[model samples]
Target chain A: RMKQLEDKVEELLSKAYHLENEVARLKKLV
Target chain B: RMKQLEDKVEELLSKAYHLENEVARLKKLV
Candidate 1:
């Protein structure tokens, strides 16, 4: 159970990182 | 330029919210 929750958080954090990168990319283009 | 970037960020935010909800759901199942 703990492991599953941990994995989910890691997955979400990875997604957050991707979004942050996208923001940076758009910022450069603007 | 600013407005378009804002929209893209907003869309990303919406995706983040969905990911958060999924995490919550996974928590319950764990």
Candidate 2:
């Protein structure tokens, strides 16, 4: 159960990281 | 000076809007 929870958290973190990069790129345009 | 600054800010806001949409899409995936 703990492993599953960790995996879900990791997935969310990974998505957030990608979104951050997208924001960085957007900032460059701004 | 004022016109240029406003334009710059507007541009930034536009990019931020795009970034917000991207984040919302990412959230749906998560």
Which candidate number maximizes DockQ?
A: 1
**How do the predictions measure up, each by TM-score?**
0.50, 0.49
TM-score of chain B of 2: 0.85
lDDT score at residue A2, model 1, on the 0-100 scale: 50
Q: Per-prediction count of colliding residue pairs?
A: 0, 0
Per-residue alpha-carbon lDDT of candidate 1 for residues A1-30, written as tens digits (9 for 90 to 100): 556555655666688886667556555655
The number of the candidate with the highest lDDT is 1
* Clash pairs detected, candidate 1: none
lDDT by residue (tens digit), candidate 2, B1-30: 555645655565566667679766765553
After superposition, the stretches of candidate 2 with alpha carbons farther than 4 Å from their true spots are: A1-30
lDDT of 1: 0.63
